[PDB]
Design a protein around this ligand. Structure first.
Ligand SMILES: O=P(O)(O)O[C@H]1[C@H](OP(=O)(O)O)[C@@H](OP(=O)(O)O)[C@H](OP(=O)(O)O)[C@@H](OP(=O)(O)O)[C@H]1OP(=O)(O)O
Ligand SMILES: O=P(O)(O)O[C@H]1[C@H](OP(=O)(O)O)[C@@H](OP(=O)(O)O)[C@H](OP(=O)(O)O)[C@@H](OP(=O)(O)O)[C@H]1OP(=O)(O)O
Ligand SMILES: [Zn+2]
Lengths: 220, 258, 220, 220, 220, 220, 220, 45
């Protein structure tokens, strides 16, 4: 990827085989859990769009998600084209023209054009826009592979509350909603879907008590 | 043979087992089992095989031969380790039991020219090394160590080593009852030989059959198909094979041409 | 391969054993499939034609693919020779004529000639042409190795549609056709081979129903 | 992460995938035990807060611990905001203001801000403050993860004292207290809760005895 | 091996343990075959004869082939002594003397004089000559280890054409001969020993037909 | 670890994850035995006391030995303080006083003090003294962890002398005693604790000899 | 180990953990087979006696061979001391006297002494002498650990000549003697100890035939 | 469910299994495994 040289300037480089192999194996091995979203951003920082496409195309199977993300990328490119008018006219060398809906995805842009965009002043974070589009695609993939919603989790009659709250938060991180709704649901559902002793302890503690005191007092 | 050919084909496609296993399980002649096995793209006689072992006891060499299918035991002590005595024992056991293949292990005396000539005269193929059967390797050594256990027990009540050894092997063969079945080794070996005789009668009955090109018709279709190789005729039906497919057709839907 | 130095000119080095080991192990463990088409390119960036041939020759088994790609390389070399005629006459000192059909394959050219051609002014993308010939050979070999067409895929009487549409898309990608043909088959073929309940649901959805609504409708 | 270059200034470096994989596997597989706390400082030396956040959020399972750590990070950010008042006014030329509560967590600051802060003169160890906050969170989560305290541990009569003193030290090191309190505990409770035969033997030996003679006293 | 520093000079370095470990494990796990010829040649690039003999001697098993290749190395050393004139008399100081049959084999030349030969003006590629001798010896070894000849190849009645052509080309590669006879064999022999249906199909196809058409027509 | 640049100064560096991972794995799978004592000395060359304490605290399990070595380190630090003259008062500019008992253990002294002491003129081998203290602690730990004594081992009737002498030397190596008594005991009872037949064979061979003859005679 | 510096002064280099891990795993894995003789010499190129001792002490189990090699090291160190004249006269700064029998073994000599001996002009080959001593010790250990002679190998009547020749050469390499005796035995015992058919074939082939001719003739 | 069925078949000989008309019990994998093992199916208890 784009790696800074030893006490020098930024230079282009290819993706190391180890990183892409680790990415593809960790993607294919277990599942499309939400934890792939951070790890992806831990392996595709400062990378040109064509290398993103190369890393994307190496997935074994799960082509329905690939079609989903391709369609979302196409529609986002169309939205970008319609919102931002095309700047026509002569274009000076070194600072190329505005990228189009196909140039951002890198399907028509070449390596030299991407390097020029990266080194262009003012900076062009087209790779970052493609990365955030991939992030949205991964979010909707997690939505596709979500086993169930949050509105049906109920703690077992004798199940310890530790696993209950752990799986509740595991499902919560995969939910797609606003932050305020997430705060409201984590304040309400936790006390409304607990065992009688734990919920009586909760109501004795009253509102405004964080989960720390809740699950240190409900112990036993 | 009551739709057992299809069951055997399914079992060989899912397992690829030995032909004799299918023949015994579904009560079928070995020929159809062999042809079903040959039909498999990934695939290509237990009685009459004996194993010979040598042991040292009281400073003397003792040679013991044991069957694989039945486990019948014969043993004898030899005054001196020479190939002539082993050849004599081999020809005696050939003249006493029907032996087809003599399997042994690595040994200087087993590779002598005398034993080679003796086995060539009898027409018995001899070899040494890994046992032919992938299982029952431990049976030979367990039987040998049982014999070693009993010879020491019965030695005190005998006056000579040879007599004691022969009495011990007689007890092991006859007066020692096993588990499943619970009868003498002589009974199981004679049953095995009787079933071998019956299967050879079946083989000669199949030998009575020959080319006998046969045409067949299925489901009363107006067309006649063939030629097909005749396998067996009986019970008002005929079982034949063609294009790696074995099927049974009623006689009213077939014709036989000399 | 030939890679840049720290603020220096392009230099040649031997192929890393890890890269070739990973290539051969992923070739042997995974059958010829579309996902290997991009991976190879990620493992062949800036590589000389001699290095490409060395990597190619380490493949064990499936020699029919090797013969097919060798034949295609020979025919493409003949095409390049006939379209770009072999110029005659002595070459000026310090310069070498354009690589021939045998030169691009590396059979009649040494490593020094490859180094001189790659860094020559103007640059000679002989390695890139050889790489694209290998790409065409891989495309036709994955066309060969695909054992099933796209018109003979039918969902089971109660088989889940997830893996059904997944394998449908997987086989569709391995099909060499045009963009409009792909659009037509992804509009019409998938709905004609589905279970009656959610296939009639899809028929109720009408044309243009993207796969998200179709998968959320066929749930259960 | 952040590593100084040989004979050169400090330069930003991408995160090694092997380090992240080792961290996540060692966190997920063994336990939430104290020995992972030093290991963290081994794998987090000289890193931006974004690197720490990425390392933290990549863990799978135990999301209650992650929520607790996030809440403690928020409360420590509030503490930093209250101890250090928000300085208004224009930004000094080439001197960005001190990070806010949301800036140390990295949720509202781009990577360039941390890159500038790390190399700024005088240096701003905001990443070290975030690391210490994470250390406090790890301490409290490993405290709550301990199922048993040290005042109720008892030795069975039918097992050697080896595993008993082992688990006593496990529980002793899993609790956070003053060093003198730990010395008092290891001076009193190691002999006040042993088997009666070993207790009488050690009473006969007298106080002020090292652990080696204690364990060699009543072997078997 | 002898490696060049980044914009530096040629210096000697010790053999990485991973290289020799991979070599020995791929030798012991893979039966001798032509594809091991490139694998050996891609790892010993720019290696002194000392490294060559240390790699050769570490191979365990099949020592008969090792003895045969040592005998061929000795006979090639004799050939080098007998065809290349032996420069009798003491050469003037400052120039490295002509390498002997033992010197190229590495049985009498230490690393210092090997490096001196490498840096001599003009360069002396004794390592390359020894490598090509090893290549010839390995070709003889793989000729020895050929399981069967080429004229006895026959397609079974139920044997698929794919496996038949794969093994035919495998044995063709295992054959050591000129390219012309290889072309003659691959044009005449394969059609003679095919199944009758595909034999008649290929006869209907006629001469001048590429193998792709043959394999597509032979299906079924 | 802190390392010296070639023809340059001494620069501090972080411990590579490979070393720590290998150390913890070998500690886990190779429960304390004499051969682990050299291993540590092979993985602690040129390491600061902070690195030593970090890799010491990462151990999991067997914390009784860890507390024993911590106590021995404390008492050795006290001995160093009481023996070596402790200087106070003014300190010459550009220099710092020798590390104290708490400084050598690394509990109080910061990493910068260790860096300055290592690069001081003359250098302070505080890290080496801490390493040798750890070596003594490991020696007493492995003495404690001895499964049995050395004068009670015997040889079974069906036990060949090979593994007998193997376990004899294994137990003998775990003895912390003078070399003279070790040689005296390895020459007398090694036969007195064997099977009678080879015992009388060795006795007939003569009182005392080279062990190669005594093992060749005892063969079979 | 002792690594040459690029147009500078050589400095001590830390031992990579990879070499130690590979050495211990290959030692523990298969056997004390002759193939470990070259492997060791590949993992100890230009290493100090201290490094050699550290490598030696890393092994686990099989302490009898360790005792053998230690006794041989002691006796050959005594031989070296008795043959090499004792140095006399004052020792100038920058120079050191000849290493003692204990110093070459590295038991008492420190790394500084080894560095001083290496930098002394002319360099003292103490490391090479100790390495060849270890080579002789390993050779005699392998001699002891060979549970077969050369004259007891027999070929079965149906046993192929392949594994017969393989085991013959394995035992030939396992046996240590003069080269002329090895040539005589490999020329005589090979024909003299074969099956009668191939024995008469070899007798027809005549004496002095290359082993390739006999192995091709004995086929069948 | 098919995995558990084939494991219990490998551990014990079963010729008939009594289950309800549930989707998991009638799943394609379960049916394929039971037909491959030659185990008769009976629905309704
Ligand atoms: O040789 P091994 O004992 O099997 O160890 C290997 C080796 O790592 P080391 O050289 O550090 O021991 C591999 O490195 P390469 O041989 O491929 O260069 C590495 O592969 P990566 O470095 O590419 O990850 C692999 O890891 P993995 O099994 O995850 O592929 C790892 O195995 P261990 O992780 O079991 O030590
Ligand atoms: O990080 P280090 O201890 O210096 O070791 C590195 C590291 O290899 P490991 O992670 O297996 O130790 C590199 O891998 P990355 O960290 O860059 O992913 C590898 O680079 P390659 O993957 O390109 O082989 C490099 O080798 P090199 O210096 O040849 O580039 C190798 O250094 P060593 O080979 O000296 O151990
Ligand atoms: Zn079969």
């Amino acid at each position: 990827p784009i790696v800074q040289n030893l006490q020098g300037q930024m230079v282009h480089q290819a993706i190391s085989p180890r990183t892409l192999n680790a990415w593809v194996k960790v993607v294919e091995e277990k599942a499309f859990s939400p934890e792939v979203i951070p790890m992806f951003s831990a392996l595709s920082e400062g990378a040109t769009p064509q290398d993103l496409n190369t890393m994307l195309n190496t997935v074994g199977g799960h082509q329905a998600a690939m079609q989903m993300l391709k369609e979302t990328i196409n529609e986002e490119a169309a939205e970008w084209d319609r919102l931002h008018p095309v700047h026509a006219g002569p274009i000076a060398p070194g600072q190329m023209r505005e990228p189009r809906g196909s140039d951002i995805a890198g399907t028509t842009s070449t390596l030299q054009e991407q390097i020029g965009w990266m080194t262009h002043n003012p900076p062009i974070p087209v790779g970052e826009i493609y990365k955030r589009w991939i992030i949205l695609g991964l979010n909707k993939i997690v939505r596709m592979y979500s086993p169930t919603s949050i509105l049906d989790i109920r703690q077992g009659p004798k199940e310890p509350f530790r696993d209950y709250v752990d799986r509740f938060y595991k499902t919560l991180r995969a939910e797609q909603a606003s932050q305020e709704v997430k705060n409201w649901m984590t304040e309400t559902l936790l006390v409304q879907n607990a065992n009688p002793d734990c919920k009586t302890i909760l109501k004795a503690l009253g509102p405004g008590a964080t989960l720390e005191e809740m699950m240190t007092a409900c112990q036993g | 043979f009551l739709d057992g050919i299809d069951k055997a084909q399914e079992e060989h496609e899912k397992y690829h087992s030995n032909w004799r296993a299918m023949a015994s399980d579904f009560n079928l002649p070995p020929v159809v089992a062999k042809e079903i096995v040959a039909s498999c793209d990934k695939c290509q006689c237990s009685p009459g095989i004996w194993q010979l072992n040598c042991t040292h006891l009281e400073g003397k060499v003792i040679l013991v031969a044991v069957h694989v299918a039945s486990g019948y035991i014969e043993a004898e002590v030899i005054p001196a380790e020479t190939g002539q005595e082993t050849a004599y024992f081999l020809l005696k056991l050939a003249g006493r039991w029907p032996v087809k293949t003599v399997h042994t292990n690595n040994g200087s005396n087993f590779t002598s020219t005398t034993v080679k000539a003796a086995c060539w005269w009898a027409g018995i193929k001899q070899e040494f090394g890994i046992p032919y059967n992938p299982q029952s390797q431990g049976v030979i050594e367990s039987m040998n160590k049982e014999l070693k256990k009993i010879i020491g027990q019965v030695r005190d009540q005998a006056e000579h080593l040879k007599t004691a050894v022969q009495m011990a092997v007689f007890i092991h063969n006859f007066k020692r009852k096993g588990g499943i079945g619970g009868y003498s080794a002589g009974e199981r070996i004679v049953d095995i030989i009787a079933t071998d005789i019956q299967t050879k009668e079946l083989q000669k009955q199949i030998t009575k059959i020959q080319n006998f090109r046969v045409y067949y018709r299925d489901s009363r279709d107006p067309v006649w198909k063939g030629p097909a190789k005749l396998l067996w005729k009986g019970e008002g039906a005929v079982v034949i094979q063609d294009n790696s497919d074995i099927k049974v057709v009623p006689r009213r839907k077939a014709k036989i041409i000399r």
